[PDB]
């Protein structure tokens, strides 16, 4: 399944750790490393979603001036990745908050979108992703927020770029029919956005756990979301997703990629959650080469590798 999915890789965290802000770097939050990227993408990875922490990009307010050696940081990860040939999926996980508040200004959240897409306009392989998960918000703000995302980005001349918006409840696969309809509504004028949503396969859908409910689990929370992208004729995937390093969840993992792979009218790919240099022992760790999701699952993902 070399040719099933148009995109398919792996989150890249590490630069939105800790919680103090600014904080330090190599105390408090890194950046990816290029060569464990450079080994994902010798593995067949095709694609990077990127985290990083808009209070570290942006100091002193969200249309207010860079934090330059942050960006610079940013953008060599970047550069790792698209000079790499893969793309890289620009994520500013948020949580639709800037300094804990919830990012009420559209037009602020707008300007904030204009100009980071002018610090990558340039770059075809950049992808743009409006906030990690948004939850526990007005559902017509968020609506909002993607469209304002996206009207900035295309207003800063990033033409040739994908936009990845994210709904509310956290963007669950799972809960996406129930609370983020209205997100049918979004418009760009290139006709490139891709609705991403994320989701675990533990009992309460934390990703906490590195227990599974079930075989089916993964594709029955994945299928409502896919008929809703049937329906409205509209595209997606899977940003986040894991299951833990045992037989239960490897079976999970395979049938909600196997189904996705049957419904790629819709599914354009997935991203595991996640590599990064920094996770140790996490349970879901694709860091190479001594990560659990690493060693334990990459080989159920090597068929659309
Ligand atoms: C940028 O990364 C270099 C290491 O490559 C490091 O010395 C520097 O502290 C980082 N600065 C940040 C993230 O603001
Ligand atoms: C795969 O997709 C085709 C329609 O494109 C359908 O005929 C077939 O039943 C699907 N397979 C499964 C297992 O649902
Ligand atoms: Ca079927
Ligand atoms: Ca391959
Ligand atoms: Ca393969």
């Given at each position: 399944a070399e040719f099933v999915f148009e995109w398919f890789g792996s989150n890249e965290s590490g630069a939105e750790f800790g919680t103090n802000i600014p904080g330090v770097w190599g105390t408090d939050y890194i950046f990816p490393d290029p060569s464990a990227i450079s080994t994902l993408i010798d593995k067949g990875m095709n694609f990077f979603r990127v985290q990083f922490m808009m209070e570290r990009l942006l100091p002193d307010s969200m249309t207010g001036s860079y934090d330059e050696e942050y960006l610079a940081n940013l953008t060599t990860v970047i550069k790792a990745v698209t000079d790499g040939g893969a793309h890289a999926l620009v994520d500013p996980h948020n949580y639709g908050r800037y300094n804990g508040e919830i990012i009420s200004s559209t037009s602020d959240f707008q300007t904030f979108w204009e100009n980071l897409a002018g610090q990558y306009k340039?770059?075809?392989?950049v992808m743009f992703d409006t906030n990690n998960e948004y939850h526990d918000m007005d559902q017509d703000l968020v609506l909002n927020l993607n469209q304002a995302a996206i009207n900035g980005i295309r207003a800063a001349g990033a033409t040739s770029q994908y936009i990845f918006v994210e709904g509310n409840s956290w963007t669950g696969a799972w809960t996406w029919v129930d609370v983020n309809d209205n997100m049918k509504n979004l418009t760009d004028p290139e006709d490139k956005i891709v609705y991403e949503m994320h989701q675990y396969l533990d009992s309460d859908g934390?990703?906490?756990?590195?227990?599974?409910?079930?075989?089916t689990i993964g594709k029955e929370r994945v299928t409502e979301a896919t008929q809703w992208l049937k329906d409205n004729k509209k595209v997606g995937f899977i940003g986040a997703y894991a299951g833990g390093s045992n037989d239960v969840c490897r079976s999970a993992v395979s049938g909600m990629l196997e189904y996705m792979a049957n419904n790629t009218d819709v599914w354009k790919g997935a991203s595991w959650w996640a590599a990064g240099p920094?996770?140790?022992?996490?349970?879901?760790?694709?860091?190479?080469?001594?990560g659990t999701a690493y060693t334990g699952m990459l080989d159920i993902l090597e068929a659309y590798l």
């Open positions: 340039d770059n075809d392989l934390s990703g906490t756990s590195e227990t599974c409910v079930s075989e920094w996770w140790g022992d996490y349970i879901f760790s694709l860091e190479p080469p001594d």
